[PDB]
Amino acid sequence: DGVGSSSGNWHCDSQWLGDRVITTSTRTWALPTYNNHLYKQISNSTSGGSSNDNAYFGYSTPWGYFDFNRFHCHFSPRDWQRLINNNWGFRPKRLNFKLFNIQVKEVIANNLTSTVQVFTDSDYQLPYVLGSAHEGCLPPFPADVFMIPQYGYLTLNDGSQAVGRSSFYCLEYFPSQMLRTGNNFQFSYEFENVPFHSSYAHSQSLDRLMNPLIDQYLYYLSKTINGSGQNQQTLKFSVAGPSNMAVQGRNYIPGPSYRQQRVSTTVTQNNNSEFAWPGASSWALNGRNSLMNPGPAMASHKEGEDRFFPLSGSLIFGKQGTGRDNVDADKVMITNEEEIKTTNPVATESYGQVATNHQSAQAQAQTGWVQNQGILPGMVWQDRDVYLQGPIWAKIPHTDGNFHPSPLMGGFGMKHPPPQILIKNTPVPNSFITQYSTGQVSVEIEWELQKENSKRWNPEIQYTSNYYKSNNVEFAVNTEGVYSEPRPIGTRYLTRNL
Amino acid sequence: VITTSTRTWALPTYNNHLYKQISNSTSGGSSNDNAYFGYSTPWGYFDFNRFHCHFSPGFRPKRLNFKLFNIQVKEVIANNLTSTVQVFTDSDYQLPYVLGSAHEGCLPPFPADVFMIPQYGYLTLNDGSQAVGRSSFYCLEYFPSQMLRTGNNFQFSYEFENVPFHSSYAHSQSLDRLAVQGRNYIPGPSYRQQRVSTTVTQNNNSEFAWPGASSWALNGRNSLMNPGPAMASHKEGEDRFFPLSGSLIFGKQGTGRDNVDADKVMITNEEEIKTTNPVATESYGQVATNHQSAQAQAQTGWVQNQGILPGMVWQDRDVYLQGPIWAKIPHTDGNFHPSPLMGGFGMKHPPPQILIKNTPVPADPPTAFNKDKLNSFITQYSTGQVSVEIEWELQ
Amino acid sequence: VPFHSSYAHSQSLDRLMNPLIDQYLYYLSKTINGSGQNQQTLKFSVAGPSNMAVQGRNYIPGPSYRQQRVSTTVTQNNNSEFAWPGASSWALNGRNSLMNPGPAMASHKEGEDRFFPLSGSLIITNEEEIKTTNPVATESYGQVATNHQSAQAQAQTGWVQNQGILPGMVWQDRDV
Amino acid sequence: QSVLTQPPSASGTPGQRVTISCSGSSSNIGSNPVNWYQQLPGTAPKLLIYSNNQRPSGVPDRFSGSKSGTSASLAISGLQSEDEADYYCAAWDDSLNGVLFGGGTKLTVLG
Amino acid sequence: QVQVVESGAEVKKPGASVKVSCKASGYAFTTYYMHWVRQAPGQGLEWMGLINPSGDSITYAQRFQGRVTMTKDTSTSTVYMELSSLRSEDTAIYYCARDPNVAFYYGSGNYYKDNAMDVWGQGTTVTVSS
């Protein structure tokens, strides 16, 4: 419209309506110029390229992008509590993005005629980097101003070299809307249909589903011999009942497993050697090994053992102010998947045993351990939980086929996820005027809820803040103005029958 | 098909009209594999889940109709005409579903038999003989239920959700005959079982029933793999071998509960599915474990357990006259080929549970008020008739 | 039926990240302080551009059933008859059938064009395009932990020679 | 207002079972793991049980630890003369925002 | 082997300040927490303060706040405890304890770090007398 009139207002709140919630978040951002307006090839060779497993080839672009893909972008700690205590499920429905109050600076003075380019890729033609759990999200706390992350991508590599099949992308080849200080930008997005994330824990275990008072009518082999001696072979059949529940026939079996090595928080229980990389579980792709992280959804530890965690099997966040490299255990926050132990195998245990031979009169029975077990008919499992600090959605790769596309770091797998939103400063002149821009961003998401009808008589477990006194308030600022998240908050408190 | 079955039942008082905590420690403590925690209820329930209930000596269920009538409440023996029997169905599936565990207590196969209604109980989360804070307790009185005197009746109908037809055909062709030829499809998954011979001189002279058994571990507790993935019971021509925990074993009429001989039971065999499925005691196949070279021979290893691969096909387990019909699919984020492993039709919303108890009638109370709950009751039981009608669609 | 996929992927599954930006996730970098008895620690690093092998990923490559590797250069092969003895097979009703072609997997690692799976391919066509989402036919799917470590016992792993479907797998079919 | 309390003394004869218990507030025993320390006269305390029931390496199987509600108990079985020492039950206390020790329980063998 | 060499016994008058040093050797100094706990001659144990593996974060018992100071020296692998404005009741033995539990567990309900100290120093007898 003009210079002296605002192109948008400040919208931050939540609105709880019946079976849906509407989260609205506004932040202030600052966009510099990246690469001095240039598109530059990058490779491990530019960093030296130590290991083959780390080899990559790609391009940095002058463009930036917006990332709202973490839950603490859209939910306050109180709103997250109001969600996870009252609901069995939720999922995103609609998305509303706005960009307004443009200001462009020179180095400081206002530049009224400079522009800012912005577009979205809604046909999904660009490499999609929003599913990789990168930094650069919107700040959890609305009073924080954030820098916009640079957009860059990777393609096929051989060592640090490219191949004939590698693609190069010029984002200048995309039509975009150019904004001055009076223009604003918006679009609406419709989340494709995803299943509700299960915000609950089972009050039963897969192996306890039986009526404890009544026998089965099936028989199991109780004795293969009469007693001590020679030639005592026999076939005896007890019926499965309450007293021995381990042998009863069952219709459903626990889900798949890929075993993790366990590490103990008490450090003197760990082996005195380096096994972080060597003792890791991993998968191999075209010769390059990738750590299996976080991997298939499995229980972090057995009941009663809280000090053991799967090596790569858990999601680990950092505390406010924590460093980048080789920080102490206290500095980070290790989440656990203990809720899913009722239906999923423990990450650090074998799945079970299998017969490795034929017994005979001359040969004893032999059983081996199952270190990994892929999907079998009859399996049922739980997906990994989502956290307030964790990602929301991911992009399902475009492939011939997949199984259970739900992303392994948590969240809603989508073939058409929320599109990437690209932004850059239009250059004003290999000699350009030093320039940066700033403004506001508001995102609005409609969430659908699933209420619990549960008949449980005794009271549930809820998420609750500590009653006791402390120097600071949890999920608040300190005396220096630093906002911090004291702990990871999972979604699973309420219970369902199995 | 459409079947109709009517039976005569008797419902006692269970637990003296009382809810009780039960655990392995109340049963003596057992071991960790057998550890459990739960509750026993005064309520009973009806289970028609077995085929011989609905049938005398492709298909799938469609509709269900259930009636409860001719209620007679006895006191202990005289008639009590003023007494009610309470009954409800769990149609939101809010209670723990015990009907898919293959328990005894079915409608008897022979229509003239008069049977006892089994007592309802359930299990919850356990760390041992103990409970955790996540363990749930259910009061069935906190469910609305109809109350019936001797002239009242109870009926409801149910609609089976859409399920695939059960295959009741034997293939004339085998997957490999559709050795080194290229084939578009491969046999289904395997999880190996130990091979037991009904000729006792052939089997190893040692105890290996539990120790040599295939199992799966959950939260540190080992469960037997039973019956397990659906596989052929034996190779062609060998009829004396059966998987140790692989097949369904029924007892003959009058068979004892503990340590019966092999002539007292009926071992089912899956040998019809051997066209598309691997043998249970056989390995799935071989894989290369190395890279050959001028210095190294080609090496192979046996695949004991193999998960789903693209291009696999398999038959489910056969249903038997004495076998179960349906099971409830657990409510989870994910499952694969939910068809229950003991056989039958898997359903997210199976036929609902039908819960029944006798209303307690207190004995003579004291003539001065006391705040204790009443522990003194009239000895009382009920009896009546039950009809169940299922419409079976055939293929 | 779904469309056949004529195109090849210009990205590999493990490279889907933004190369310029760190993750907000940590991994276990260091278990021992170093060069002494009772040097035991937990140190955690951010996963990022410099170390891409440890980053958290949402999807994993598809299923594998390993084929024995054969070189089109005859002098590199072992001097023995391994056509049948070293072949990957599946058993049906006590009968052994070769696995041909088998699960769709990459014929060979990038840069080595002389190797082919013994019964893995259609005969000699190569699958090399699908190595972005699929494991190599002649390689293990990866490693798993075979033990609980402790102060006494070192950590142990083992190779996964065959790996069935897992949630979060993506794969390409064989090319027509 | 949050306290850890144990009986000042206990007694038993060798081979008998002896249980030592302490009572704690909701802030400490109720929400935090409980560890047990055994101290012989003239020597520093030795950890016996940690994380409620877990036992450290080099510690005899006879010692056992349990936590129920807001009360924690330590069980000693197959008692011997050597076992006689002062026993302390400890737990982190939230209100205090520090570690809190019981008053200690002096065990006395008989003979 | 792991060892925690406690400092020497001292004798102090009221108002004086006493510093007790704790020298660890045979393991990684940075990795573990260090606890200070005093025991009066006839009385039970009393927890004083805490210092984290990094040395940046320190917690004190409320009784001792403002009159106690703790510092950790990575160079010589020594932890120090500072007690000031001594009183007759201060006289005790001062133990230095190593804590092998590195991380917090974040389960349902309030989080916690296990504070069990496996290695204890021999101890130092500090008498406050005239």
UniProtKB/TrEMBL annotation, chain B:
Main subcellular location of this protein, as a coarse class: virion
One term under GO cellular component: T=1 icosahedral viral capsid
Compartment annotation: Virion
Family statement: Belongs to the parvoviridae capsid protein family.
Keyword rRNA-binding assigned: no
Protein name, UniProt field: Capsid protein VP1
Keyword Chaperone: no
Portion held of the full protein: 239 to 688 of 736
Biological source species: Adeno-associated virus
Transmembrane segments: none
